[PDB]
Amino acid sequence: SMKQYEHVTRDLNPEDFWEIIGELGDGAFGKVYKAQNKETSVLAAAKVIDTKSEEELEDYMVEIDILASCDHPNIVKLLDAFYYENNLWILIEFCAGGAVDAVMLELERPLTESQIQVVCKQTLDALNYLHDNKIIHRDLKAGNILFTLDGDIKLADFGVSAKTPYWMAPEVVMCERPYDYKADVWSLGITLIEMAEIEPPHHELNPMRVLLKIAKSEPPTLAQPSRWSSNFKDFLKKCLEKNVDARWTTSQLLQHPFVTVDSNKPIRELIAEAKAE
Numbered sequence: 001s002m003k004q005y006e007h008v009t010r011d012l013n014p015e016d017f018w019e020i021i022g023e024l025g026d027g028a029f030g031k032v033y034k035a036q037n038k039e040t041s042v043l044a045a046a047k048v049i050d051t052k053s054e055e056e057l058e059d060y061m062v063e064i065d066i067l068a069s070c071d072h073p074n075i076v077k078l079l080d081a082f083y084y085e086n087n088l089w090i091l092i093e094f095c096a097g098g099a100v101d102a103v104m105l106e107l108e109r110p111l112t113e114s115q116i117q118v119v120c121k122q123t124l125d126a127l128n129y130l131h132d133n134k135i136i137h138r139d140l141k142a143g144n145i146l147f148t149l150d151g152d153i154k155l156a157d158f159g160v161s162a163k164t165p166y167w168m169a170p171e172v173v174m175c176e177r178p179y180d181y182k183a184d185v186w187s188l189g190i191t192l193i194e195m196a197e198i199e200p201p202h203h204e205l206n207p208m209r210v211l212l213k214i215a216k217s218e219p220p221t222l223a224q225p226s227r228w229s230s231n232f233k234d235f236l237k238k239c240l241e242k243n244v245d246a247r248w249t250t251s252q253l254l255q256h257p258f259v260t261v262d263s264n265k266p267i268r269e270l271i272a273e274a275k276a277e
């Protein structure tokens with residue numbers, strides 16, 4: 001009778017294995033450090049979470065085990081996880097380009113369409129893998145999308161938006177097993193608008209009004225539609241579809257002409273400009 005015996009998270013001092021090079025983001029996206037393995041010299045990013053209950057901790061440890069089980073080139077690898085002195089430390093592969101939203105704030109501008117296309121394609125590849133393996137992400141947003149040194153995307157988890165449920169699907173707002181595959185697809189659509197406009201739809205509202213606004217409004221569209229291609233606008237319509245029967249799956253979206261793209265050059269250019277700023 002096969003059974004999982006233990007989590008991958010260890011009850012050990014992370015400092016026994018990892019050196020902290022420095023804090024990343026100066027608090028702008030949480031308590032995050034650049035770290036380096038003492039024996040192997042491998043680089044990592046370490047996120048430290050102060051858990052508030054046994055139940056919260058267990059939920060995180062379950063989620064970490066899922067991440068550890070993923071094997072896809074566009075999903076970040078888990079390098080280590082520790083629980084030590086009331087803190088959860090989660091270490092992933094270091095992604096020298098950082099998070100997509102942090103890049104936008106650094107450069108004070110959104111991604112160009114050619115950049116969004118690449119991010120969309122690679123993130124959709126990761127999301128499709130998850131869905132095919134019966135996993136839902138539930139927190140898709142630009143703060144969970146990371147750039148490598150070579151201009152590829154890695155999907156992460158537990159990210160914080162760089163500086164409220166903006167990415168939540170309307171049926172999930174209205175019906176509180178609430179999250180499912182279709183809800184992730186909606187969140188992808190919101191993330192695309194986030195990358196096109198820096199902030200997601202309804203960012204200007206009082207946050208208390210946001211769920212109501214999502215429930216009662218038509219799906220959001222791009223604020224300046226003449227700046228974007230018909231393919232991008234159509235791809236968005238397939239994600240941001242209130243009728244759950246008509247909202248496209250990740251397998252359908254993979255065939256959409258918007259994500260027919262062969263080169264990550266636009267992202268290499270983006271991160272070279274961020275790196276030189």
Ligand SMILES: COc1ccc2cc(-c3nc[nH]c3-c3ccncc3)ccc2c1
Pocket residue numbers: 024025029032044045046047090091092093094095096098099102143144146156157158159160
């Ligand atoms: C799943 O555990 C983690 C651990 C570190 C994380 C760091 C980030 C992050 N946010 C801004 N920059 C980073 C980051 C991630 C990897 N390499 C450099 C910077 C996002 C999600 C993370 C999630």
